[PDB]
Amino acid sequence: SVPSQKTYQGSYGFRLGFLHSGTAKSVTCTYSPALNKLFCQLAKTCPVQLWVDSTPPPGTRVRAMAIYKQSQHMTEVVRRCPHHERCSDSDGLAPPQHLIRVEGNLRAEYLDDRNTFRHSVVVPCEPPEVGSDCTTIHYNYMCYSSCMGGMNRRPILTIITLEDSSGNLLGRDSFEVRVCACPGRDRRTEEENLRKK
């Protein structure tokens, strides 16, 4: 099986937002709207905004899951490579096999699906802080796209789903991710490739 990636705002008008970090050599996380693609360094903070048009009910949650973007790999579970799963960099909550972690939220829950074996991380929805119009989740990606025996240079998508208390779908959005040493340079390169095409 393969999780759906269809964008779905749903009844609450759910969608993602990203900061405008630029493409300087020093940038650690940067989002390309033209590519719908996040470029980030290993284990660095990736701020992802959640936006809604109306308030979802108490108990609504936000889940993140990675899948391979290419159809011929979509049924393979995205996991950390044989090196990183053994490097003992745990935060005490994320299983060492999980690619995606949530940073700084003790209510994050990590799921190994008993039927699909896919990994995901889910947090309770919290309303924006006073003076803010959206809520931000801080994600970390714990392997490079190039890691041998893991992603092995294959592109991935992150699927973000808004779910009710039973796990039923309320909204969905997604973005491609490249985890790399120089996200600013790679974003510039890929945007230029797109322009040349």
Q: Give contact residues for Zn ion (rule: CB under 5 A).
A: 81, 84, 143, 147, 150
Q: Around 49, how many Cα atoms within 13 Å sit in the side-chain half-sphere?
A: 12
135 binds, among ligand 9GW, Zn ion, none (CB under 5 to 8 A by kind): ligand 9GW
60 binds, among Zn ion, ligand 9GW, none (CB under 5 to 8 A by kind): ligand 9GW
47 binds, among Zn ion, ligand 9GW, none (CB under 5 to 8 A by kind): none
Binding residues for Zn(2+), by number, are 81, 84, 143, 147
Closest approach of ligand 9GW to the CB of residue 186, in Å: 29
Q: Around 57, how many Cα atoms within 13 Å sit in the side-chain half-sphere?
A: 8
Closest approach of ligand 9GW to the CB of residue 173, in Å: 11
H helices of the chain, in order, are 183-196
**Cα–Cα distance between 112 and 165 in angstroms, integer?**
18
Q: Structure tokens of 128?
A: 């924006």
Nearer to ligand 9GW, 22 or 127 (CB): 127
Please name the residue that has the structure tokens 């945007």.
191
Closest approach of ligand 9GW to the CB of residue 11, in Å: 12
Closest approach of Zn ion to the CB of residue 40, in Å: 14
129, 146 contact by CB (below 8 A):
no
From residue 135, give the alpha-carbon distance in Å to each of 149, 169, 179, 189.
Answer: 35, 19, 23, 31
Say whether 17 sits in a helix, a strand or coil. Answer: strand
Point out which residues bind ligand 9GW (CB under 6 A): 50-52, 55-56, 58, 60, 62, 125-128, 134-135
